[PDB]
Amino acid sequence: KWCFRVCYRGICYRKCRG
């Protein structure tokens, strides 16, 4: 239920883990 911003190589996405 935790959403964190993941930036990978400039690609940023809101990844929600749990």
UniProtKB/Swiss-Prot annotation:
Cysteines joined through disulfide linkages: 3-16, 7-12
Locations listed in the record: Secreted
Keywords: Amidation, Antibiotic, Antimicrobial, Disulfide bond, Secreted
Record GO biological process: defense response to bacterium
Keyword Transmembrane helix attached: no
Modified residues (Arginine amide): 17
A GO term from the CC aspect: extracellular region
Primary location class: secreted
Highest taxon above the source species: Eukaryota
Reported tissue expression: Hemocytes.
Function comment: Significantly inhibits the growth of Gram-negative and Gram-positive bacteria.
Family from the record: Belongs to the tachyplesin/polyphemusin family.
Protein's name in the database: Tachyplesin-3
UniProt organism field: Tachypleus gigas (Southeast Asian horseshoe crab)
